[PDB]
Ligand binder design. Sequence first.
Ligand SMILES: [Ca+2]
Ligand SMILES: [Ca+2]
Ligand SMILES: [Ca+2]
Ligand SMILES: [Ca+2]
Lengths: 90, 93, 15
Amino acid sequence: HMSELEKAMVALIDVFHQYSGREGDKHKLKKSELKELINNELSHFLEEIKEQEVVDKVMETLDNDGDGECDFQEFMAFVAMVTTACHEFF
Amino acid sequence: GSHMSELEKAMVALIDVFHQYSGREGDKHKLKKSELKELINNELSHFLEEIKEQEVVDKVMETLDNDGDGECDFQEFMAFVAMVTTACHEFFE
Amino acid sequence: GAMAATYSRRVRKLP
Ligand SMILES: [Ca+2]
Ligand SMILES: [Ca+2]
Ligand SMILES: [Ca+2]
Ligand SMILES: [Ca+2]
């Protein structure tokens, strides 16, 4: 009987793989997959992304190995960032 | 969509499990080593081997503590979650 | 479940 914490971790993995698998490199999020993830799955925490520039900036912030995409480790840093910001408003 | 996503409910759970343990002793916004130990032993019993040696919790807290105050705050807990989740993922690809 | 032992850009309002 997995804990709530453990279930949460697995869902982090499941949603990364759902979106990263759609286009191109099936193990990474490109900008379009990233925008969709945020607009579809984070609509209650983040304002909708409507402009290219915003996706560019986010990906730029997230992409620390320079390949233009977001791998899973870079995705976790994103989740840490967001969850920590939300943690304040609770 | 309009429903809370699995991602968004995942995040809420991370917040909830933190406060449920950080609230127990001392600072209610931080995990001292005793709270951290209970968290890991009770909530990560499938992903991490149980901790019973004090040296282990000291070492884990040492790696987790970057503000240098001897306790794990939420930001530091998220880093820990990131690390653990990444490890389980590495055995999933 | 193996396991892993140990040692290893704008927020909404929201009510
Ligand atoms: Ca992809
Ligand atoms: Ca990258
Ligand atoms: Ca505490
Ligand atoms: Ca600390």
